Design an enzyme around this catalytic site. Structure first.
Site, PDB file in Angstrom:
ATOM      1  N   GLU A 291       8.181   1.520  42.773  1.00  0.00           N
ATOM      2  CA  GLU A 291       7.682   2.253  41.618  1.00  0.00           C
ATOM      3  C   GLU A 291       6.362   2.073  41.427  1.00  0.00           C
ATOM      4  OE1 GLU A 291       9.013   3.946  38.983  1.00  0.00           O
ATOM      5  OE2 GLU A 291       7.532   3.291  37.506  1.00  0.00           O
TER       6      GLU A 291
ATOM      7  N   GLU B  33       1.013   9.103  36.687  1.00  0.00           N
ATOM      8  CA  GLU B  33       0.548   8.561  38.003  1.00  0.00           C
ATOM      9  C   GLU B  33       0.810   9.374  39.087  1.00  0.00           C
ATOM     10  OE1 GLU B  33      -0.566   5.494  38.722  1.00  0.00           O
ATOM     11  OE2 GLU B  33      -0.964   5.750  36.520  1.00  0.00           O
TER      12      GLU B  33
ATOM     13  N   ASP C 278      10.062   0.543  35.228  1.00  0.00           N
ATOM     14  CA  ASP C 278      11.026  -0.206  36.049  1.00  0.00           C
ATOM     15  C   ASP C 278      12.391  -0.196  35.988  1.00  0.00           C
ATOM     16  OD1 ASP C 278       8.419  -2.697  36.192  1.00  0.00           O
ATOM     17  OD2 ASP C 278       8.476  -1.013  37.615  1.00  0.00           O
TER      18      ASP C 278
HETATM   19  N1  LIG Z   1      11.986   5.573  23.023  1.00  0.00           N
HETATM   20  C1  LIG Z   1      12.131   5.521  24.313  1.00  0.00           C
HETATM   21  N2  LIG Z   1      13.430   5.626  24.770  1.00  0.00           N
HETATM   22  C2  LIG Z   1      13.925   5.827  25.885  1.00  0.00           C
HETATM   23  N3  LIG Z   1      12.823   5.624  26.888  1.00  0.00           N
HETATM   24  C3  LIG Z   1      11.676   5.358  26.755  1.00  0.00           C
HETATM   25  C4  LIG Z   1      11.194   5.404  25.293  1.00  0.00           C
HETATM   26  N4  LIG Z   1       9.958   5.211  25.355  1.00  0.00           N
HETATM   27  C5  LIG Z   1       9.558   5.069  26.703  1.00  0.00           C
HETATM   28  N5  LIG Z   1      10.566   5.457  27.392  1.00  0.00           N
HETATM   29  C6  LIG Z   1      10.689   5.430  29.057  1.00  0.00           C
HETATM   30  O1  LIG Z   1       9.471   4.459  29.497  1.00  0.00           O
HETATM   31  C7  LIG Z   1       8.864   5.127  30.412  1.00  0.00           C
HETATM   32  C8  LIG Z   1       7.346   4.434  30.695  1.00  0.00           C
HETATM   33  O2  LIG Z   1       7.441   4.029  32.201  1.00  0.00           O
HETATM   34  P1  LIG Z   1       5.805   3.297  32.467  1.00  0.00           P
HETATM   35  O3  LIG Z   1       4.947   3.310  31.516  1.00  0.00           O
HETATM   36  O4  LIG Z   1       5.718   3.897  33.755  1.00  0.00           O
HETATM   37  O5  LIG Z   1       6.578   1.892  32.778  1.00  0.00           O
HETATM   38  C9  LIG Z   1       8.937   6.475  30.193  1.00  0.00           C
HETATM   39  O6  LIG Z   1       8.923   7.231  31.514  1.00  0.00           O
HETATM   40  C10 LIG Z   1      10.094   6.591  29.446  1.00  0.00           C
HETATM   41  O7  LIG Z   1      11.131   7.351  30.249  1.00  0.00           O
END
Ligand SMILES: Nc1ncnc2c1ncn2[C@@H]1O[C@H](COP(=O)(O)O)[C@@H](O)[C@H]1O
Length: 453
Positions: free
Chosen positions: A263, A293, A436
């Protein structure tokens, strides 16, 4: 329950585990700090902008400074000899398992996986107690590799890596001097150190010889923690030394047949980020990342024009094009991209799985992500029913139709492209480490369907 063919999955995890000790700040807390340390001394100290915390005032000034911006910040303690002084002065509300290995390994234990082998350099008693009791920790005793439970392999005298996190909501207000302060946005101020003095991001010399053995008993691995590697260490070692040996671990694991997943974390140090691109990404089978990313990776590979189109505009056609580049360039089997609206999966045309199955992999990933988002941490498999009650984002259904149109037009699809909408949770409890969670859900599900074939 049929999807849960995953329980037949065994998996290896390295390298980063820690303890998260969280304070949930309120206005009264910052008020007490202002009174106990003074307004002028904090104001003067904020002008100073210390880069490491040496005296308690450093922490007060940098915490308030960050609260003013609503933007995240991490300041390490100047020395590990201040840890116990810090913890008595600024007490936490709750302790918890931290680290991508520790968090995900505990979740995979709760999902009843066949065998879950987790490894971290430090295993102190307090740390080892944070593991789920079903996890296995590799150990070399009497010239043989022994998987034992962490509460039975821990070592006294082992230090403990602790991340001190201070959570502040949006709009927390307090006066400082004449400056009235309001949190523009919710964010967390973190006191934590990257390992140098106490441990390193590596598989120790004794275990190295047994990595291929671990490779035989495991269907797949998930490796993380590379953002903790430093450019240069005081003992004269360098990022290159540890990234070289991290490459060796992947190669020893893959003498036998396993899938390795990565990841792609948000590493703010571009020199260490370029190391992950060079040493890890070409030797792995699966990668998960957000929109930010993939553009950061494309920028390292030279697709500057493409990188900005994705960053500025975020059009799905451009993300798909950038994912196709990653897939062909690096020996990967699959590329996964996630955003609040969708999850995208791409695999070469000869992938053993069908487009139908790839969507099932994604469906399970959205459910698991929505369960944790709505409930905070997941504590039981029953909780996945809460994620199933979260409907698909409506704009993602639109992107699905768009991708379907895209595919029909082209002459040759040498690729399998699948996009499903996300189960967005509007008023989520937690958002940390959601990436993750999603990425692990899709990868484990993907390893399952491969194993059935
Ligand atoms: N309110 C939400 N409901 C469902 N998934 C979320 C929400 N907010 C953020 N995410 C997921 O969290 C991820 C962030 O991943 P990262 O910032 O790479 O750890 C995003 O790609 C979304 O898929």
């Amino acid at each position: 329950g049929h999807m849960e063919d995953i329980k037949k999955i065994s998996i290896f995890l390295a390298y980063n585990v820690n303890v998260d000790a969280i304070k949930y700040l309120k206005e009264e807390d910052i008020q007490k700090l202002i009174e106990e340390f003074g307004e002028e001394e904090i104001i003067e100290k904020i002008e100073e902008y210390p880069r490491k915390i040496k005296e308690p005032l450093d922490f007060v000034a940098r915490l308030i400074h960050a609260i003013k911006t609503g933007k995240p910040a991490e300041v390490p303690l100047d020395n590990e000899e201040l840890n116990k002084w810090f913890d008595s002065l600024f007490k936490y509300d709750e302790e918890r398992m931290g680290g991508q290995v520790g968090i995900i390994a505990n979740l995979l234990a709760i999902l009843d996986l066949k065998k879950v082998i987790a490894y971290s350099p430090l295993l102190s008693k307090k740390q080892a107690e944070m593991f789920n009791n079903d996890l296995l920790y590799p150990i070399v005793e009497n010239g043989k590799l022994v998987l034992k439970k962490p509460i039975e392999a821990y070592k006294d005298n082992d230090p403990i890596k602790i991340n001190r996190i201070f959570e502040f909501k949006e709009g927390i207000k307090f006066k400082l001097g004449d400056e009235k302060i309001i949190a523009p946005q919710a964010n967390r101020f973190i006191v934590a150190s990257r390992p140098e003095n106490l441990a390193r991001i590596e598989i120790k010399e004794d275990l190295k010889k047994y990595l291929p053995e671990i490779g035989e008993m495991v269907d797949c691995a998930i490796l993380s923690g590379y953002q903790g590697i430093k450019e240069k260490y005081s003992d004269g070692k360098t990022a290159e030394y540890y990234f070289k040996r991290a490459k060796e671990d992947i190669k020893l694991l893959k003498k036998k047949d396993i899938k390795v997943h990565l990841e792609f974390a948000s590493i703010q140090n571009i020199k260490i980020r370029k190391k992950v691109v060079d040493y890890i990404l070409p030797n792995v089978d699966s990668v998960g990342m957000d929109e930010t990313e993939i553009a950061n990776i494309l920028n390292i590979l030279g697709y500057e024009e493409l990188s900005e189109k994705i960053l500025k505009d975020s059009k799905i056609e451009d993300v798909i094009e950038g994912a196709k580049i990653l897939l062909d360039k690096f020996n990967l089997e699959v590329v996964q991209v996630h955003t609040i609206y969708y999850i995208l999966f791409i695999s070469k045309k000869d992938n053993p799985l069908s487009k139908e199955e790839l969507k099932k992999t994604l469906e399970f990933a959205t459910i698991l992500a929505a369960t944790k988002a709505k409930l905070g941490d997941i504590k039981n498999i029953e909780d996945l029913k809460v994620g199933l009650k979260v409907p698909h984002n409506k704009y993602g259904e639109l992107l699905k139709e768009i991708v379907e149109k895209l595919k029909k037009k082209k002459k040759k699809e040498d690729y399998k492209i699948v996009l499903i909408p996300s189960r967005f949770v509007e008023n989520p409890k937690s958002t940390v480490g959601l990436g993750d969670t999603i990425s692990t859900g899709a990868f484990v599900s993907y390893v399952s369907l491969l194993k059935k074939k």
